[PDB]
Each structure stands twice: as structure tokens, then as C-alpha cells.
Design a protein around this ligand. Structure first.
Ligand code: FES
Ligand code: FES
Ligand code: MN
Lengths: 568, 569
């Protein structure tokens, strides 16, 4: 029955081996009796500031299992801290997924609890677990408290760009900027805006992989530990009911996630990770699904980078349950969630305590504010833009290309005061995709050249093959596929070329002949391998493009959780 | 870079905000981004690796020592490897965790690292990926657990599992007396209480100069262990300022000393594969033939299971491996540098021996000519290892009929079949259990003997395979046969009947079959299919190297330093 009994139930020479060592620290023999063993994937790390409190979170989950008669065991994987990993945390997104997948199948686990929070750590565990497909429940770590500074509030990342552009413009002092370090981010948890970590927590509960309310409650709130403990209870039942990830991660679950991602003004990185998760659970989902389901919908939460308020205000207003309830005419209602009820039955009666934060559907915060997927000769395989946090007057715009051949050249050249750029140009950035950076870093939201900032404007049309943080704003076209370092038509844009953007027409058209690109394409040579050694060589030579999830090619798909050979 | 962490923390731009504000979300003084040595502590704690269960208190011990010396301690996780839990074997996952530790050190602002390593595969996976960075690195072993206490006698980790199970199937031990010693064999924190792999690698780390003196043998629940993790936290901060990097410690002299110490302690056969992988990352010429050259003829000075009688607890109380290195005064590279800052002799030249019964003197060796021996012949063209420290002398030179098992499932079913034509003089042959055949190199070399033979009081008969063995195992077991049968090696061609000659004195493993018959047999040989068309295992089979080179992935060999990577925003 249980697969853990292939370890703990054997009455042979091997059963001694799988049991005698586990009893070295005092574990009662009844723990190996056949009750569900629960693996707790602990991404706790002091190098992951947003998950640094996951020791407590695991213990609450551990209590939950003991309450319900299960055998809980926590294990580690590589944790990813978006603020500290370099060249970028996305570079190691796939490496952590192999830790999760192999640690789950290789160990006597019947159920899985995922402690995820910090940006990249949410897809790392969701992707590795989907390839084993045991009864799995996700516990999100929770956001930080809203920043506090001089009687004002500070936003995670969103106020980092706004204040660094304000000092680059010369309108704010550099001393005031660095005085906000300890004042922006107090308290435990992940980014306090509607950035990647917050949307991915919403994606976890929009897909149905968590108990209701899991996304929005802050990390130091008491209900954070309640939900972790309550999910430690539920996962025991799910093992008995065999509620595997296959039954939750249906196509209707991904559509629902896309629907609420546009309703919350979600990160542009949710688009990439959701494709990678679908790529391993075995659900056909392309970028076109995001456009067909997303842009038509309005954005209903008034949170940065799209709005004003923060994740603290968002939870007190009702959180994701209140947002799903308002998508009641478009959500796949009978889509089951991890607690044994459909998504609509967990949110049909969710309250709303503040409509200035969570708007009514019939009176939304921003109309047609869902993410758009652009097509054209410059992005033949797709490119995304987030109009919720973009300038409307720039959504239909045409300008000359100011090209930055890579990120180094972009930093060597952006601050050049004798650069020929005005507000109406189109800043282009190349060689920052999966093979480009390497790792597809959040470099899309380029800081505007200082000459433009002093003029008094903070937005210009920027196109790139890189990502940007969910914390970021502006009119930024991202995930241009194929990337420049792959041979994509982005690699051939030169200074002076005219790029026209019409997000209403899904247009990213490069004004240049089909015959002129072909001579440029002949002189173009792919950049050299950045390491030719270690994980990075494996990454650049195996990672797929941004339009498919930026996953390693041999990691796509599932493999289940069979009972492997005995180890001796 | 002088203080590579200042590329994050000492930045006076926008990015400098990103790298500091987030770290300060739990209350960290701004002066921790001083430029003081930031010390990454790679914690392999997990409840699914019962031998690293106490590492949360170990990691805290390390931090204390870092805080004393004005450093910045940060712990971070990587995939942990519990050998008893991970199937089909924890070896298959060593190189994966090797990538975790390496990328976590290069991508994070770390001036120095502390390695918390206890269970078997947790030492190499941590040492390898650290060697690929060549940063100021200190290793901290978790310690062996207390001896097993059962019915007023002692139980040995791993060793007594083989010997009690071989007594159940021989019909002399209750099927329940086996399972009642279950909770009595392991009753404290730590790794295997024998001279298995986990204690050998702990002895390797200290003999390689990669740890403070006395690091190997300290039991986990003994208080000197926490003191050591605290002392290593003190020491690593000063090494960052001295820029004492791994390549300055892990030189050839260190590896040569490690081969010597492994022989005198009766170390595991698995230490051979892992040091070769460690050398392959750090960039030091070390070949399988070096192990026999430097180590075989050296005497075994340690009277521990599976070679002797006592347990790791006694080994610490007699002076640990420092007392062994002292008895090795006339063979070791005396002037090899260790982590504290003094040569290996200055750390051990006055090491006291409190018990000449478990740590013998050199001139009173427990066993002569007891180092691991590599073999050469038609059967193992790239080398095969054997541990005579736990073998039987009469079968050290032996020839007999072959009884073959095409894979391991075939063995689990044919070995017990009483209709099998085999006596105690036949050579047992097991195929398709090496890096690619199993997959991973599981410890199936110590094959259970035919139940017919065990009823004669026979405990040992010669057994060859391309598999590995438990460091706690024994017998005249030829191991690590390279190339493995799955990779096309000659072992795949052994057939029910061929005579196989063993002579470790001559280092000869010869299969008495014509050379032409073999190439004619290899006509009908077709490689086994990959176990998985997907996942890490697929990458593993198509990139793992053989046991002669350390079983690393080919694209993971060598080092890449630890230069400053590009900004992440
Ligand atoms: S830094 Fe962890 S959530 Fe953005
Ligand atoms: S089980 Fe960890 S030492 Fe053998
Ligand atoms: Mn082992």
C-alpha cells in the first residue's frame, strides 16, 4: 500500500538497515508501523533572507503531522535567495528542482510538504514534486510587513527602483537612499509587494496546491503558523486518500491561476514558472494560454508595482480568496484543491473588508490589465509585457533602437552623458536570456538614462530577452524568444532600427527587411560558453527558451515515485 | 578579489541596497557588512539522514566560533545524503549534491566556508564541490555514534548486520534476535560506529589536513565535538584573512598521507573512489595505482571492526587518528600543511596513545601488508580494488570455478537456490552494478554467500564484481572492477564455469578464457538500456565516469575558482 513500507516494513536483512539507523536519536518503533511518512522540504537558509524563519514553519508542520498520526521528516535542498544568488537565482532554479525530485523519490516518503517563499524557491519545489507526483501540499512562507520610513511606507523592490531612479535623476540624496535599508525590510518573510514571491504564493493557492488563505497572510502573523500546522494535518489525510498532484494540477487549475494572476496584477515571472510546472506535471500549456485567458480580465488589487497598497493591506482586505470570489463567472468552479474541496467552494463566501484594495469586478482597479503576449518578427516565439504597471501612452509607440549588446555594455554605456537618446527611443538589451546572462537575470527594467530622468519622466519602451522582477514597473517587453544568444532575431537589432509596439495588436515589429536581417544573421556568431565546466555548462547547453519555462530539456516530464532497488 | 563578499555588501550603488536590505530583515547590525569575513556554513542536517540529525546544534557551534572572531556566519542547505535511506543508492546522488555546494558558494557572498559532513556520501559531495571553488575551507565531521549495547555485549554498525544476517540464513540466530538488536545497535547521534566509510572519510579529512587535529574520532554526543565545531568557526575567519585556500592544503603530499593513514586505520574501499573525485576537482595527479604503491604494504595499526574487534569509541579514547599519524612518523610527508597553520607532524608529533590494544604501535602492527590493493588483469583492465584488512589469507591467492549473476536481481534469486552447483572454492561474479549498471554503484559487492556453504561454518569465499562495498563489510571481495559490465568491460563476458585466478601478492585478477573467445563473446554483448529516459539519473548514466576516476560526472571535473559573478539585477 504505502511506498514507505518498502523501507520501514521489510522483515529481512534490509528492514533492519532502513529502521536501525532511524532509531539512533530515539524514534518509537510504532512510527514505522505503516502510517504516512511525510517529507518536509525545508528551504530554510540564512542566505535566503525571505525563508530565514522556515525553522519555525517546519516545526508547525511537524506538529500537524504528529497530531494526525503521521511520521514527519524534514530534509534540505538548495535554497535560492533572489537578492544574493549571482549571476541570478534563475540560473539555479533547475538545480534545486533536481534536489527536490531525487530527495522525494529516493526517500521513503508517502506525502510531501513544500516550504516555499522566496521568489525562485516556489517553482524549484513545485517542479521537482510534480515529477514524483505524490500527495503534495504547499506551505508558502508569507510576505514581510509593509516597510516603514519617515512616516511613509516602503515597497519591496518597487521602492528600490523608484528611489534609485530618483537619486540617479538627482532629485533624492544618496544618503536618504541608504538610510532605508534596515527600514524597508523589517520582520521576517518574502517581498511585501505584488512581486514574484507573492504571485507564486497566489499561484500555489490558485492552482489548488495549498489551503485557502495560504498566499497573503504575513510571515510573522499567527495565522501563518496555523495554516502550516493545519496543512501538516491535511497532508496526512491526502496520503490516505492518495490525493496526488495529478488530481489538482489539471488544465482547469492552470487556467484558474492565469485568471487570478491577471486579477492580482501578477509578476511577469509567474508566466515562466507556470510553464515549467506544467512541463513536468504533463499539462499542455503555452504562452497563448496566458494571452487568451489573461489580458481580457481586469486587475482588481490596488498593490504595487501596479497600485499603491502592499501585501499587508491585501491580506486584511481578504487576500486571494476575495480575489477568486470576484472572478466567479470565469473561474473553473469545480476545480479541486488540496484540502478536498473545489476552488470555488473555498472562496464563494470569502469576505471583502476593504474595496479600495480589492475592487469589485464590475468596478475594477485597472481595466484589461492582464499580462499580454506579443508576436512578430522580433519575438517569433513570444514576448510578455505587464500593462498593469506600464504607461498607457507608451502601450502604442514607435521609436528608434538604442542598442546595448549585453549587460556589461549596457552598464558601460547607459550613464554616458554623450549618448544620443531621448524619451521616445526604444532601449534594446541583448544576451541576457537563459544562455545569455547566463540564467536570464532580472535586467529588463533598465534604469532610464540620466538625461531623461532630469527631464521629469520615469518610463521608456524597453525590450529585452531577459526577465525583470515582479517588483518592477514600466513598459518592459521581456522573455523575447528566441533569446539573442540562441540566434533569435533580437540578436540583430542595431542602433537606429525602428521598433513599433502595439500591445493592443500583440505587435512587436522590427522595421527592417527580411533580406537585411539575413546578412546580419550571417556575421552573427553565438557567444562563447561562459564556463565549459560545472553546472553552468550543463545549463547553457541544455536549458530551453523562456517561452517553454526555461527548464532543462532532460528534466521535462514526470517519472512518478516507484520503489527502486535495495541499496545493498 | 580580496574580500569577494564586498562585491555584494560593500557596494555604494543601487545593487548595494538590494544585497543588504533583505539580509537585515531579521535584525542584523550594519557592521556585519563590514567587509569582515563572511563564513558560509554548509549544513547537511536532515531527519532523513539520521547521522546528520544533530547538525543544527553543530551549525550553531560553528557560528559561535565565527562570532567570537568578528566574522559573519551564514548557514545554507544542500541536498543531504543518508546512506540507509536513499535508494537505489546514495552514491548515485553524490555528484548532484556536489553541484549544490559548489554553486551555493560561488553565487553567494562567501569569503570562507565551513563544511558540516557526517554520513557517508556527505563528506565527498561537500569536499568535491568545495574543491571546485578553492576558497578558505574548513571541514567539520559529525562524529561516530556511541557503541551499540545489546545483551551485555557490543554491536558494530554495519559489520554486525552482515554477520548476524549471515547467522540467521546459516541457521544459528533467531529471526527475531536480529530485529531486537535493531534499536540497541544505534542509540546515539552520529555516523557508523565502525571504521566504515563515514569514519574513514572523517579520518581522510583530518589526514588530508582539511580539519583541525582530532576531528575524525570524536563521538557525536561527546562534548569535544561541539568544541571543535566552535574552534573551526574561530579558525576559518582567520584563514580568510590569511587566504588559506584548499589547493594550498589539498596537495599531493596530503593525498599521499591520506592513502597512508587509510592503510593504518584499515579504512574503507570507498575512500579510494571519493579521494580520486576530490583530487579530480582540486587538480592533483592521483591515480588508482598510487593507492597500492603508497598504501598496500603499510601495516594496519587499528584494531577496529570490520578489520578488528573494537569500535570508534575506543578509537577516540586511544588518541584517534593523531595517534595513528604519530606511529606513521617515518612514512608520512611530515611537512604537509594543515588548516590550523601547522604541518601535520606539528599537530601529531606529541599525540598520546592511551591504548596500544586498539591503536597498535608501528613495530607491533595489528596486521602487516594490510593496505587496500589494486588489481590488474584481463578482467579489470582499468583496475580493481580489494581490502585485505578484512579478507581471509588462504583465499588471498585462490583460483576456482565461476558462478555468475548477470545483474543483482538475478543474484537475489539464484544465490539461495539449493539447486546451484557451487562449493566454497568457486568465485562469485556479479555484473551490472557499477556507476551505470545499477544505476549508481550500490554496495552489493559483499554478496551474501550460498546458504549451503554457510551451514559449513564457512563465512568467506572470494567474490568479484563491478559494484561497491560497505566500509563496514569484510571478506575477500574484489571490487570497483573497471570498466563496469554495463560500460562494456570484460566482466560482462564472464560465464558460468570460467576459472578466475586471484593473487593479491601478484596483483593479478585473471580470467582463464582465451583472448579470442572474449572478443567473440563481446559480439553478442549489447549494453543495458538506460534506467530512465528522464531526470537526473538519465544525465547521470550518460555522464558518470568509471570507478577508476572517482565516478564523477565528466563535465563536473576540475575547478572554476570563485571569481565575482555578474550582478543579478
Ligand atoms: S527577495 Fe526573496 S522575495 Fe524578493
Ligand atoms: S549510515 Fe551514515 S554512516 Fe553508514
Ligand atoms: Mn556507504
Amino acid at each position: 500500500v504505502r511506498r514507505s513500507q518498502a523501507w520501514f516494513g521489510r522483515l529481512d536483512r534490509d528492514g533492519f538497515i532502513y529502521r536501525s539507523w532511524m532509531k539512533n536519536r530515539g524514534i518509537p518503533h510504532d512510527q514505522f508501523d505503516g502510517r504516512p511518512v511525510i517529507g518536509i522540504c525545508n528551504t530554510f537558509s540564512e542566505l535566503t533572507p525571505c525563508n530565514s524563519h522556515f525553522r519555525t514553519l517546519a516545526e508547525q508542520v511537524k506538529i500537524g503531522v504528529w497530531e494526525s498520526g503521521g511520521f514527519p521528516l524534514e530534509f534540505p535542498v538548495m535554497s535560492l535567495g533572489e537578492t544574493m544568488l549571482r549571476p541570478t537565482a534563475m540560473l539555479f532554479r533547475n538545480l534545486a528542482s533536481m534536489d527536490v525530485e531525487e530527495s522525494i523519490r529516493g526517500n521513503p516518503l508517502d506525502g510531501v510538504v513544500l516550504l516555499m517563499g522566496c521568489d525562485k524557491t516556489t517553482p524549484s519545489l513545485m517542479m521537482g514534486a510534480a515529477s514524483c507526483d505524490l500527495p503534495t501540499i504547499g506551505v508558502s512562507g508569507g510576505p514581510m510587513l509593509s516597510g516603514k520610513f519617515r512616516g511613509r511606507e516602503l515597497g519591496s523592490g518597487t521602492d528600490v527602483w523608484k528611489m534609485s531612479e530618483e537619486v540617479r535623476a538627482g532629485q533624492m540624496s544618496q544618503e536618504e537612499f541608504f538610510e532605508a535599508e534596515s527600514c524597508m525590510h523589517r520582520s521576517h518573510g518574502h517581498c511585501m509587494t505584488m512581486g514574484t514571491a507573492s504571485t507564486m504564493a497566489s499561484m500555489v493557492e490558485a492552482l489548488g496546491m495549498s489551503l485557502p488563505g495560504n498566499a497573503a497572510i504575513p510571515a510573522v502573523d499567527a495565522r501563518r503558523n496555523l495554516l502550516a500546522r493545519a496543512s501538516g494535518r491535511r497532508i496526512v489525510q491526502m496520503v490516505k486518500d492518495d490525493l496526488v498532484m495529478s488530481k489538482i494540477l489539471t488544465r482547469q487549475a492552470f487556467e484558474n491561476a492565469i485568471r487570478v494572476n491577471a486579477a492580482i496584477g501578477g509578476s511577469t515571472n509567474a508566466v515562466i514558472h507556470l510553464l515549467a510546472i506544467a512541463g513536468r506535471i504533463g499539462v499542455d500549456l503555452t504562452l497563448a494560454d496566458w494571452d487568451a485567458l489573461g489580458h481580457k480580465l481586469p486587475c482588481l488589487v490596488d498593490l504595487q508595482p501596479s497600485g499603491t497598497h502592499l501585501m499587508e493591506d491585501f491580506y486584511y482586505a481578504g487576500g486571494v480568496p476575495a480575489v477568486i470570489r470576484e472572478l466567479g463567472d470565469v473561474i473553473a468552479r469545480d476545480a479541486l484543491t488540496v484540502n478536498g474541496q473545489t476552488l470555488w467552494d473555498n472562496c464563494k463566501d470569502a469576505p471583502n473588508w476593504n474595496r479600495e484594495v480589492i475592487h469589485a469586478f464590475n468596478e475594477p482597479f485597472k481595466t484589461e490589465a492582464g499580462i499580454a503576449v506579443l508576436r512578430g518578427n522580433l519575438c517569433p516565439d513570444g514576448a510578455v509585457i505587464k500593462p498593469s504597471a506600464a504607461t498607457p501612452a507608451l502601450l502604442k509607440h514607435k521609436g528608434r533602437a538604442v542598442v546595448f549588446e549585453n549587460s556589461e555594455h549596457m552598464h558601460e554605456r547607459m550613464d554616458d552623458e554623450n549618448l544620443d537618446v531621448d524619451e521616445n527611443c526604444v532601449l534594446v538589451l541583448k544576451n541576457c536570456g537563459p544562455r545569455g546572462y547566463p540564467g536570464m537575470a532580472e535586467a529588463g527594467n533598465m534604469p532610464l538614462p540620466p538625461k531623461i530622468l532630469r527631464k521629469g519622466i520615469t518610463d521608456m519602451v524597453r525590450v529585452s530577452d531577459a526577465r525583470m522582477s515582479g517588483t518592477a514597473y514600466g513598459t518592459v517587453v521581456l522573455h523575447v524568444a528566441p533569446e539573442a544568444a540562441a540566434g533569435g532575431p533580437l540578436a540583430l537589432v542595431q542602433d537606429g532600427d525602428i521598433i513599433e509596439l502595439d500591445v493592443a495588436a500583440r505587435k512587436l515589429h522590427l522595421h527592417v527587411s527580411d533580406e537585411e536581417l539575413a546578412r546580419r544573421r550571417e556575421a552573427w556568431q553565438a557567444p562563447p560558453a561562459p564556463m565549459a565546466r560545472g553546472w553552468v555548462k550543463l545549463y547553457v547547453e541544455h536549458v530551453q527558451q523562456a517561452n517553454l519555462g526555461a527548464d532543462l530539456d532532460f528534466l521535462r516530464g514526470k517519472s512518478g515515485a516507484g520503489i527502486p532497488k535495495d541499496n545493498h
